[PDB]
């Protein structure tokens, strides 16, 4: 439909805890915009915002939705996040793409922990925040109570903008303070009455109006003659002052609304359209190369694609935000990655579900295209002159993982296909195929996240899968040096296959001086360094073959045979464990036969000698250790330290700040297969953690003995 200038386009992302009456409020905006006819109810599951089958099946939103609402010369790009704790990826994508964040407060519950999580996310992403109160129709609500709760929760920089009078089911009016008005509605709701406030609330109205204008002046001093001295500049420049304060997060406004009764949603529309940071008036995004990318109509034609909703019967719709320039139907756009020079077609502006075709899209706006071929999530499409490969969006580390497998080992290709399709659906569904582990790894954000994926596989497509606990990457090694001796000769086949290998194994460190004397078994030996070569391992670790050939006792021409034997024994551990690392090998004695010396003899000799050397040496198992950064309030510091102590953890350091204390610990992955669920249960979901690999380390005797016993228990079947 009608094209809008970038100066009249705003991007808004709603944020709030579950059970906050937000998605409904979205239907309130859709109904009052006139784009839809009736105002549906989430109970009836007829809401336009909820169309994914799981989204109405669960009774709450699962994916973030994008939609447009039109008003007087202003159109708002409303993005409704799922609002749950385990759908962080949609929220962070919305924050990265949007311009401003909105927080909705439930009057019944007041400030909730999900509100804290969303506030932390937007603080990390540095976006403006406006507070809002929902559910004023519930008796279990007190505007003063939530006001003081938020006063004592965050800084004094915040300030309310409206003063509701009635409460609970009897709510039929409220007072606007920014514009100095009182609003009332019919019991049906929808038509505000701009009748002025009575003199009863005149005193408090003036008090909080003076407080608000003083706060706005402190946000930015406009130097106008009466601005901070006498009174505010009515309301016209108050919007600009509020926006400027929101630029630096110097003030967070507070609003109230009733979703069911539609109390003053028009007031919200007017306020949001009036005051909000502009698309250009915000800290501009950089590119991968670090060159500034200022959104402008006169700029080149580049597009970035983030959302790839694949809801059935509506097509593989792919949204996108216009980074710079414009876009027209029929244009040919280059693809930054796996470039194919995609030729575009009829574009559509979608209000969620139903979409409306549009002719031209300006920079800094969200559009949607269909029937694409080589466009995936995170891929960006650009013109010929504008080489951009935008990768400015970062997602939180996968806090949970599980191994997937269908009920029948006959649809592996279907697993790959649909799992990839879901990957694009939300990049958080990190899919990985560990070739060494022979398992397909799925990384999510929690138990409920994987439950959601399981439902989408089972019901949306009628596909059967199971979840199994992922395998653990174990690496073996040695600690005690030992002497390995072997002699080989086989006349049963062809040549004599003569072989004689004598070698010593030793754990390798970064700077050992490799001493030349080793008194083992009442026998000392002398080692002479002639050729030093280090061969690294692709699975990590290093191997060294400092030779000790006695003045040419064994020809170096056969050394690759010993090396091939060594790695052929090495790639399989003598016990359970994929490989071994940090092993220093010294070979001293050997014999050479003019006709019976051959490479296969040294193959077998090295293999068996190294196997029996590991048998003689002390085998040890190394468990991967992942650093954990728990961000938890002090009320559960004892519980978390006790749980970690029960999780064979090593305390590193406790950080102190505000009310949440950061924790550092070295923790084995073996007991972290379900750590996120336990942490969420203990802290009520009030804490998060970050995982990252550090260094393999040793394990106690009991766990390795159990692992070995299970290894032969499994092997006994074959
Ligand atoms: N009593 C009452 N309840 C409301 C009102 N508005 C919303 N709700 C409640 O809000 C619930 C739906 O929550 P949503 O609006 O979808 O917000 P959410 O918690 O983030 O859920 P999703 O966005 O769908 O994930 C409904 O079951 C209603 O009970 C209202 O005006 N009055
Ligand atoms: Mg909602």
């Amino acid at each position: 439909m009608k094209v809008y200038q970038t100066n009249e386009i705003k991007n808004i992302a709603l944020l709030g805890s579950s059970g906050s009456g937000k998605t409904t409020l979205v239907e309130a905006m859709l109904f009052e915009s006139g784009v839809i006819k009736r105002r549906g109810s989430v109970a009836a599951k007829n809401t336009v915002s909820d169309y994914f089958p799981v989204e109405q099946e669960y009774g709450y939103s699962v994916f973030s939705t994008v939609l447009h609402v039109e008003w007087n010369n202003k159109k708002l790009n409303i993005i409704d996040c799922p609002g749950s704790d385990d759908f962080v990826g949609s929220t962070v994508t919305a924050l990265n793409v949007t311009d401003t964040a909105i927080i909705l407060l439930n009057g019944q519950y007041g400030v909730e922990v999900g509100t804290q999580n969303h506030f932390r996310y937007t603080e990390k992403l540095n976006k403006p925040v406006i507070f809002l109160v929902n559910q004023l129709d519930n008796e279990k609500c007190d505007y003063d109570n939530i006001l003081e709760q938020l006063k004592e929760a965050y800084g004094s920089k915040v300030v309310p903008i409206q003063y509701p009078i009635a409460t609970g089911p009897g709510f039929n009016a409220l007072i606007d303070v920014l514009l100095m008005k009182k609003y009332s509605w019919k019991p049906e709701g929808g038509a505000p009455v701009i009748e002025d406030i009575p003199a009863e609330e005149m005193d408090k109205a003036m008090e909080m109006h003076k407080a608000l204008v003083e706060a706005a002046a402190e946000n930015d001093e406009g130097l106008m003659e009466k601005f901070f001295e006498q009174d505010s500049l009515t309301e016209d420049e108050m919007r600009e002052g509020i926006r400027k304060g929101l630029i630096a997060r110097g003030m967070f406004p507070v609003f109230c609304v009733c979703g069911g009764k539609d109390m003053g949603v028009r007031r919200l529309m007017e306020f949001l359209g009036n005051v909000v940071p502009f698309v250009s008036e915000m800290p501009k995004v950089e590119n991968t190369d670090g060159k500034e990318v200022a959104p402008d109509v006169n700029g080149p034609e580049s597009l970035y694609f983030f959302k790839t909703s694949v809801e059935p019967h509506i097509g593989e719709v792919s949204y996108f935000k216009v980074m710079s320039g414009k876009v027209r139907e029929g244009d040919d756009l280059l693809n930054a990655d796996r470039g194919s020079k995609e030729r575009i077609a009829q574009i559509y502006v979608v209000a969620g579900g139903n979409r409306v075709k549009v002719e031209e899209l300006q920079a800094g706006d969200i559009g949607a295209a269909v029937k694409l071929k080589d466009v995936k999530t995170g891929n960006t499409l650009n013109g010929k002159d504008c080489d951009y490969k935008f990768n400015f969006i970062k997602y939180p580390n996968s806090k949970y993982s599980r191994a997937i497998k269908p009920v029948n080992e006959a649809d592996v290709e279907k697993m790959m296909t649909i799992l990839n399709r879901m990957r694009e659906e939300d990049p958080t569904w990190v899919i990985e195929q560990s070739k060494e582990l022979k398992q397909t790894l799925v990384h999510g954000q929690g138990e409920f996240h994987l439950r959601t994926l399981k439902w989408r596989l089972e019901n949306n497509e009628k596909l059967q899968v199971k979840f199994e606990e992922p395998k653990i990457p174990y690496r073996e090694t040695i600690t005690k040096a030992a002497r390995a001796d072997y002699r080989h000769k086989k006349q049963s086949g062809g040549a004599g296959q003569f072989g004689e290998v004598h070698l010593i194994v030793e754990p390798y460190k970064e700077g050992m001086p490799v001493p030349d004397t080793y008194k083992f078994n009442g026998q000392e030996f002398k080692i002479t360094v002639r050729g030093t070569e280090e061969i690294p391992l692709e699975w990590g670790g290093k191997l060294v073959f400092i030779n000790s050939i006695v003045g040419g006792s064994i020809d170096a021409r056969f050394l690759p045979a010993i090396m091939k034997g060594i790695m052929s024994r090495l790639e399989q551990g003598p016990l359970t464990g994929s490989y071994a690392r940090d092993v220093r090998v010294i070979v001293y004695d050997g014999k050479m036969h003019p006709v019976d010396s051959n490479e296969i003899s040294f193959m077998l000799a090295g293999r068996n000698a190294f196997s029996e050397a590991f048998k003689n040496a002390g085998p040890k198992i190394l468990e991967p250790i992942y650093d954990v950064e728990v961000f938890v309030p002090s009320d559960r510091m004892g519980d978390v330290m006790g749980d970690l102590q029960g999780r064979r953890a090593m305390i590193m350091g406790m950080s102190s700040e505000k009310g949440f204390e950061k924790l550092v610990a070295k923790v084995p992955l073996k007991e972290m297969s379900s750590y996120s669920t336990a942490l969420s249960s203990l802290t009520g979901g009030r804490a998060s953690f970050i995982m990252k690999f550090a260094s393999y380390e040793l394990v106690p005797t009991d766990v390795q003995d159990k692992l070995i016993k299970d290894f032969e228990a499994k092997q006994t079947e074959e």
Side-chain angles (χ1 to χ4, degrees), residues 17-24 42 50 59-61 80-83 134-135 137 258-261:
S17 308
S18 291
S20 300
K22 61 180 199 171
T23 285
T24 292
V42 306
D50 307 88
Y60 41 77
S61 314
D80 186 6
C81 79
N134 196 332
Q135 322 282 340
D137 61 333
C258 186
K261 274 84 171 182

Side-chain angles (χ1 to χ4, degrees), residues 372-409:
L372 271 298
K373 299 166 176 48
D374 291 3
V375 181
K376 308 308 189 41
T377 293
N379 273 117
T380 185
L381 260 68
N382 58 5
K384 47 203 200 286
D385 58 337
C386 64
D387 191 5
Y388 293 79
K389 54 186 193 302
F390 268 90
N391 201 20
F392 77 106
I393 182 163
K394 185 33 52 193
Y395 315 93
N397 271 26
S398 59
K399 307 188 302 297
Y400 185 69
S401 64
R402 187 66 61 84
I404 197 65
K405 173 175 46 199
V407 308
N408 46 358
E409 205 194 11

Side-chain angles (χ1 to χ4, degrees), residues 1 3 5 14 16 20 43 57 89 126 207 212 221 280 363 372 407 413 418 427 433 484 611 618:
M1 61 79 71
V3 292
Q5 304 190 91
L14 294 174
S20 300
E57 209 282 331
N126 194 271
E207 287 182 0
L212 190 152
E221 205 281 330
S280 178
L372 271 298
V407 308
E413 66 281 34
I418 296 89
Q433 283 168 114
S611 74

Side-chain angles (χ1 to χ4, degrees), residues 484-665:
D485 302 330
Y486 185 79
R487 210 227 46 84
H488 184 33
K489 187 269 183 181
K490 186 196 101 171
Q491 213 164 352
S492 80
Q497 217 161 359
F498 178 75
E500 180 156 9
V501 166
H502 300 279
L503 73 165
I504 295 193
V505 300
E506 165 60 41
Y508 165 85
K509 291 186 71 66
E510 61 286 348
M512 295 298 102
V514 56
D516 301 330
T517 298
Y518 296 116
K519 181 71 173 175
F520 306 148
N521 297 115
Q523 186 44 71
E524 79 298 337
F525 281 144
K526 181 193 302 180
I527 300 304
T528 301
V529 179
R530 192 59 51 79
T532 296
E533 57 272 19
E534 184 274 327
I535 188 167
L537 317 179
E538 63 273 25
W539 55 79
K542 312 298 175 290
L543 198 147
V544 182
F545 184 55
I546 290 171
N547 51 10
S548 60
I549 300 305
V550 176
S553 171
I554 305 100
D555 198 357
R557 71 156 316 275
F558 274 112
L559 289 180
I562 295 90
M563 295 298 102
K564 288 185 179 181
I566 285 310
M567 283 74 75
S568 55
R569 193 57 257 172
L570 173 57
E571 91 265 9
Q572 182 38 51
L575 321 171
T576 183
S578 63
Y579 306 107
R581 43 188 303 272
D582 290 330
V583 167
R584 188 187 292 105
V585 177
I586 299 96
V587 181
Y588 50 101
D589 266 334
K591 189 70 77 68
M592 193 304 298
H593 197 285
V595 66
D596 296 333
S597 56
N598 44 1
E599 325 305 325
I600 308 102
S601 62
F602 288 171
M603 295 298 103
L604 300 180
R607 186 169 79 190
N608 58 57
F610 205 72
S611 74
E612 60 91 6
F614 261 79
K615 187 261 294 180
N616 299 0
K620 286 269 189 171
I621 316 299
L622 300 191
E623 267 177 350
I625 307 303
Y626 280 98
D627 293 332
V628 181
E629 185 72 26
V630 171
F631 185 72
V632 65
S634 72
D635 60 344
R636 303 310 209 285
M637 71 85 88
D639 297 333
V640 300
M641 52 185 198
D643 171 40
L644 294 177
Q645 281 271 342
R647 288 170 184 283
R648 55 175 288 174
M650 283 73 74
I651 56 156
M652 295 298 102
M654 161 295 298
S655 168
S656 299
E657 63 184 1
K658 42 186 180 298
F660 309 138
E661 285 73 8
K662 291 182 181 177
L663 188 153
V664 191

